[PDB]
């Protein structure tokens, strides 16, 4: 369940960082990469109190 | 691959409305169109958009909005052979001006007098085509010109064609920001043992 | 005014041969280069043949190849061709006009001018089925 | 509206030079570019030089690089075009042309002059 | 355009999807993997349409064959079971006219060729002529399925795909799995071609359609229906006086849907088996728990809630109307240089 | 005393970046620049951090965590004339972008095709700057443009 | 990627009424702003009005209080001014502009269209 | 538009919120000749504001 | 601007056919409505039928449905409103008239016609 979760858009427009990083000015990536990063810290705060 | 064309100084003239140039090969498209025809010198200016004359009005007309590329070129070598080269015509009188990207391929007569001649040729009853009279010793200002026209349109659609792409490799041990036609990313690239099936 | 009759136009069978003429009448034959043209249906205007004023160089177009015998004469100041082995891609308008008179625009000038005298235009169709 | 006229042709010995000169009028200037042509007989043209008003993009032959010089004069509104050591290759029709070369569009020869003839011979034209 | 002669009508028929209809969902390579996939797929256990194109009969009814005209909505499989590669193409389109757009697949005999043009198709095409005594036995007449080809937008050619079939006897040798799918402009065909040893339905077992093309027309697509190459009965040994007639062949047609399946992805790059989780409850269990077997226990697969049956509004008892009586009904109304004016404020108007 | 200045409706832009107009009376700053130039209306919006075109990339650049104001008015009055104003340059072609607040004002020519053209002399080799040609009797979006950072 | 569309000008006797219209395209709006500004010859840009997409805190200059009114459609994705009591200075050059009028950070124009012209006169244009 | 009922009688402004609704009063007026109980502005020193 | 033009009234035996032909004249159009109504002596208007041009928004009162059918031809700027089965109480004064049917906005009668007049009777009008 923890190696999932990668594949997980957590609501940007993609989970790839590279494809969001590659496609979309900084200012407006900013907030999608911060996105990806709430969910993923999320992911890894849940596995590790499990 | 437009940079044959615009790195030659073998044309008279190679001149883009809305689209950079030298800057070709980055910008692409959806659909293009190559128009060709040929013209006289002095005439290779009414092949622009804004400008009023015959063929501005007449034979093959730009909107004002303009997206392309004109390339005009002498082609006194090839057409005109020794005493005229009729080949080639143009419509000289027209009841109504052409709209932007329009063909009118009839031979009707055109009348300005007071009865349709319908059929008959003579006083204000023209055949509508003249044809030009293309010899080589005749000045630049009448000699032959090849006249392309690259019309560049971006639909919904798919995009199509687009210019060419560079490329280099850096392959074992070295930590590279990479791109494999799209797919971007950062590591180290090793040969492998994986067996893709083909697709 | 200057006049250009074009006749011999009908539907001949493929792989045979006709003839066809232009009476030209309003000028001297030989002041102006005279010749044909022949239209498909769908396509623009086409030089097929063409007599010089003196007959000089006569040149023809090789899209016909060596399928050709144009002749003028000067009494009845009249133009002649013929079509040999006839195929369906030849069924087209041929019209017969002279040159002599081409526009005279200067840079940025005046485009209005003489221009040269053209025909009637008769149609021709080749075809291997026969007609009604 | 704009004509185009030429002058300085003839004839020069093999190794010799010559000066051909043309000038404008009815061009609203802007971005004039002024470019020699040479016509060989039997042949399309063949870019021989050309110069922008102040902007100094000026163009030669592959060929000819030495041969030509090319300059101008804004207040008679005339382009010069020197020539030294002409060899018998050189021999042609020449003409100029008034256009706009435009950095971020490209060029057009809007317009043509009449021409005048340069005749590299032995025994003169 | 030719309307043929005399076509036998009869009941169409069904048949058992079975585990067939499952194509590779992506250009990806996963290795000894279980993967979930929601994709348009064809739902297993299917009743999936069953047309035939054998005229041979005994005598009683004669030319049977199958063209209609059929909807295309998400997706389509098709599937094949000819030991005559009589079926060599298809049309796509909206309104198979003239007007919008349509699109022609017809596969020679050598290079197959795919074009996108608004054409004037035929009420009933064929491919011509496929018998002898003529241009060789097998013909593609382009134009005896349309006859105008204005105003093209795409065109393309490449190694055929028809012609894979092996041995001419023995019911049928090979069926051959296309699946078509419209999406966001490309149009992707997926094909296989598989040994079969029975007849009358398809064959258990399970195999991946891999993808042939995906071509960007960006056409609509709403209908369709199958090219089939017919022998023409004007020199035939067997009654040739004006018509046509065909030998023995027949095609499947189904429709997918989006449904939600467990991909089998072997050490390779290789689909091998394949769950459909919406099936059965069972498909259910195995798909939750992502594997193909399930020990001994009680699952929680999903979750039931009664739908709404209907909806209803409730709103008090409206009457305080509006005096629009007084100003629409009113006996004398005022001049209009001095207007009358009255003011309406709480109220229901 | 900013506030003087955003209540004046006499600017066609005045986006801040990282502050509040209204804030700034408030504050006490560190150091504060003033970057001052002239650019036509249709390229008002590349002076924004993360922009791209002309002037965002060869000519003034906005780092991504920019903060401060950017006020931009016409000057079709001061700055266009009948028989045009050919004064104002911008950059046209440039090898590679520019860093943020990086000036540049070289005018070695640049060579645009594949013609080593070392010198004046050359095909298609561009002088790198180019003028605006601001007539007043262009529209709107071709006139000049003040822009103060 | 964008244009801007103006219509509704011309002439008309002081003390009339009129009405301009400008059509947008090219958006993904969310905090669209539509304002028309007014080029006097000889003059600069000067505001006349602005309006969000809903937003509705629009503005207008002193000195043109009561007689311009600004009115948008969301669905045509157009607005248009209404003009009374057409007072002579009213002869201008009208542009509209398009930009985004944030609470926050302040506001831009964008994209500009092509403008129309009014004719506050006793005998017309 | 402008007219004389527009423009000295009843005007109304050009971003009108409300409806119009008229129908004929034959019935109700007109009785005979001998009806003219209605007036109308003919003259007036400006035009009426909304 | 506008000028109406009617045709076609008279008198008619009970049960018989009538036409009536209405001509408008000074219309931009876009969206026309005609509508034909009838006035019996001693009292208001009452709808008789009501088109919009290419739109086919028919009306046909209640009493008359059947006896009332109507066309017409924009080549010919004109509307027939024929009648089969012509009863007594029909006998009235019918007005071509026309305005603006816009289906978002509502129905409206910019001007009326000269009007004609309809008897139903056994001696003729």
């Known amino acids: 369940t923890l190696v999932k979760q990668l594949s997980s858009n957590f609501g940007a427009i993609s989970s790839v960082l590279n494809d969001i990083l590659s496609r979309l000015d900084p200012p407006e990536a900013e907030v999608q990469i911060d996105r990806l990063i709430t969910g993923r810290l999320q992911s890894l705060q849940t596995y590790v109190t499990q | 691959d437009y940079s044959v064309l615009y790195n030659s100084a073998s044309f008279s003239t190679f001149k883009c409305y809305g689209v950079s140039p030298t800057k070709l090969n980055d910008l692409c498209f959806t659909n293009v169109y190559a128009d060709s025809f040929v013209i006289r010198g002095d005439e290779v200016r009414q092949i622009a958009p804004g400008q009023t004359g015959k063929i501005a009005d007449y034979n093959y007309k730009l909107p004002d909005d303009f997206t392309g590329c004109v390339i005009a070129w002498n082609s006194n070598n090839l057409d005109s052979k020794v005493g005229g080269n009729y080949n080639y015509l143009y419509r000289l009188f027209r009841k109504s001006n052409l709209k932007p990207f329009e063909r009118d391929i009839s031979t009707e007569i055109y009348q300005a007098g007071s009865t349709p001649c319908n059929g008959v040729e003579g006083f204000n009853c023209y055949f509508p085509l003249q044809s030009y009279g293309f010899q080589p010793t005749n000045g630049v200002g009448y000699q032959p010109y090849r006249v392309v026209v690259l019309s560049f349109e971006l639909l919904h659609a798919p995009a199509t064609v687009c210019g060419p792409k560079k490329s280099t490799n850096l392959v074992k041990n070295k930590c590279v920001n990479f791109n494999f036609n799209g797919l971007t990313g950062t590591g180290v690239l090793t040969e492998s043992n994986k067996k893709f099936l083909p697709f | 005014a200057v006049q250009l009759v074009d006749s011999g136009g009908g539907s001949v069978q493929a792989g045979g041969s006709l003839r066809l003429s232009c009476a030209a009448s309003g000028y001297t034959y030989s002041i102006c280069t005279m010749g044909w043209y022949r239209q498909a249906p769908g396509e623009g205007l086409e030089w097929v043949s063409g007599i010089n004023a003196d007959g000089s160089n006569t040149h023809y177009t090789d899209s016909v190849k060596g399928r050709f015998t144009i002749s003028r004469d000067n009494a009845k100041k009249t133009l002649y061709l013929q079509m040999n082995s006839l195929k369906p891609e030849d069924t087209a308008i041929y019209y017969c006009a002279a040159h002599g008179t081409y526009d005279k625009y200067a840079p940025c000038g005046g485009f209005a001018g003489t221009y040269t005298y053209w025909g009637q235009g008769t149609q021709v169709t080749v075809s291997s089925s026969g007609q009604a | 509206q704009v004509q185009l006229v030429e002058s300085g042709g003839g004839s020069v010995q093999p190794g010799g030079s010559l000066r051909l000169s043309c000038?404008?009028?009815?061009?609203?200037?802007?971005?004039?570019?002024?470019?020699?042509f040479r016509q060989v007989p039997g042949k399309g043209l063949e870019w021989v030089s050309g110069i922008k008003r102040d902007g100094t993009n000026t163009y030669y032959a592959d060929s000819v690089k030495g041969r030509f010089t090319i300059s101008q004069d804004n207040a008679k509104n005339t382009v010069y075009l020197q020539m030294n050591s002409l060899k018998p290759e050189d021999t042609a029709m020449?003409?100029?042309?008034?256009?706009?070369?435009?950095?971020?569009?490209?060029?057009?020869?809007?317009?043509?002059?009449?021409g005048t003839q340069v005749t590299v011979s032995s025994s003169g034209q | 355009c030719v309307n043929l002669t005399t076509r036998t009508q009869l009941p169409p028929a069904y048949t058992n999807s079975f585990t067939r209809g499952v194509y590779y969902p992506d250009k990806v390579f996963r290795s000894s993997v279980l993967h979930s996939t929601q994709d348009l797929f064809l739902p297993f256990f299917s009743n999936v349409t069953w047309f035939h194109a054998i005229h041979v009969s005994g005598t009683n009814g004669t030319k049977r064959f199958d063209n209609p005209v059929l909807p295309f909505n998400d997706g389509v499989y098709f599937a094949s079971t000819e030991k005559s590669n009589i079926i060599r193409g298809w049309i796509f389109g909206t309104t198979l006219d003239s007007k919008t757009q349509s699109l022609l697949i017809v596969n020679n005999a050598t290079n197959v060729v795919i074009k996108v043009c608004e054409f004037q198709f035929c009420n009933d095409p064929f491919l011509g002529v496929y018998y002898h005594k003529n241009n060789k036995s097998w013909m593609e007449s382009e134009f005896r399925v349309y006859s105008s080809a204005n105003n093209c937008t795409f065109e393309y050619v490449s190694q055929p795909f028809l012609m894979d079939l092996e041995g001419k006897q023995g019911n049928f040798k090979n069926l051959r799995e296309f699946v078509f799918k419209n999406i966001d402009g490309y149009f992707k065909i997926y094909s296989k071609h598989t040994p079969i040893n029975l007849v009358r339905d398809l064959p258990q077992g399970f195999s991946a359609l891999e993808p042939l093309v995906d071509l960007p027309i960006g056409i609509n697509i709403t209908r369709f229906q199958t090219l089939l190459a017919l022998h023409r009965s004007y020199l035939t040994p067997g009654d040739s006086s004006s018509g046509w007639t065909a030998g023995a062949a027949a095609y499947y047609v189904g429709y997918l849907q989006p449904r939600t399946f467990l991909l089998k992805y072997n050490e390779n790059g290789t689909i091998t088996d394949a769950v459909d989780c919406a099936l059965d409850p069972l498909s259910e269990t195995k798909c939750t728990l992502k594997s193909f077997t399930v020990e001994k226990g009680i699952y929680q697969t999903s979750n039931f809630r009664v739908q709404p049956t209907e909806s209803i509004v409730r709103f008090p008892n409206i009457t305080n109307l509006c005096p629009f009586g007084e100003v629409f009904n009113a006996t004398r109304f005022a001049s209009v240089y001095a207007w009358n004016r009255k003011r309406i404020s709480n109220c229901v108007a | 005393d900013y506030s003087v200045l955003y209540n004046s409706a006499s600017f066609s832009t005045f986006k801040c970046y990282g502050v509040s107009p209204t804030k700034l009376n408030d504050l006490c700053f560190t150091n504060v620049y003033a970057d001052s130039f002239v650019i036509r209306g249709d390229e008002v919006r590349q002076i924004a951090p993360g922009q791209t075109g002309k002037i965002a990339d060869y000519n003034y650049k906005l780092p991504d965590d920019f903060t401060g104001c950017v006020i931009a008015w016409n000057s079709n009055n001061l700055d266009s004339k009948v028989g045009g104003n050919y004064n104002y340059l911008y950059r046209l072609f440039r090898k590679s972008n520019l860093k943020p607040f990086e000036r540049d004002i070289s005018t070695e020519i640049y060579q645009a095709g594949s013609t080593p053209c070392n010198g004046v002399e050359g095909f298609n080799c561009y002088f790198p700057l180019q003028s605006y040609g601001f007539q007043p009797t262009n529209g709107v979006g071709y006139q000049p443009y003040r822009v103060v950072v | 990627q964008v244009q801007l569309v103006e219509s509704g000008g011309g002439s008309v006797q002081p003390g009339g009424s009129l009405r301009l219209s400008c059509v947008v395209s090219?958006?993904?709006?969310?905090?669209?702003?539509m304002g028309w500004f007014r080029q006097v010859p000889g003059k600069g840009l000067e505001w006349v009005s602005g309006i969000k997409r809903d937003g509705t805190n629009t503005y207008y200059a002193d000195s043109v209080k009561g007689r311009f009114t600004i009115s948008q459609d969301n669905a045509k994705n157009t607005v248009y001014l209404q003009m009374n009591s057409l007072k002579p200075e009213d002869t201008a050059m009208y542009y509209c502009?398009?930009?985004?009028?944030?609470?926050?950070?302040?506001?831009?124009?964008?994209?500009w269209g092509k403008g129309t012209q009014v004719t506050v006169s006793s005998s017309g244009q | 538009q402008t007219g004389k009922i527009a423009d000295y009688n009843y005007k109304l402004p050009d971003d009108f919120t409300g409806c119009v609704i008229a129908w004929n009063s034959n019935n109700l007026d007109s009785k005979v000749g001998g009806n003219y109980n209605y007036l109308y502005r003919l003259f007036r020193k400006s035009n009426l504001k909304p | 601007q506008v000028q109406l033009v009617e045709s076609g009234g008279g008198s008619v035996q009970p049960g018989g056919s009538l036409r009536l032909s209405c001509?408008?004249?000074?219309?931009?159009?876009?969206?026309?409505?005609?509508?034909?109504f009838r006035q019996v002596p001693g009292k208001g208007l009452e709808w008789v039928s009501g088109i919009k041009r290419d739109g086919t928004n028919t009306y046909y009162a209640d009493s008359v449905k059947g006896r009332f059918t109507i066309s017409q031809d924009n080549a010919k700027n004109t509307v027939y409103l024929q009648m089969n089965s012509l009863k007594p109480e029909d006998t009235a004064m019918?007005?071509?008239?026309?305005?603006?049917?816009?289906?978002?906005?509502?129905?409206?009668?910019?001007?009326?016609?000269?009007g004609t007049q309809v008897t139903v009777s056994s001696s003729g009008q």
């Open positions: 502009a398009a930009g985004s009028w944030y609470n926050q950070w302040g506001y831009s124009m964008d994209y």
């Open positions: 090219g958006y993904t709006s969310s905090s669209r702003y």
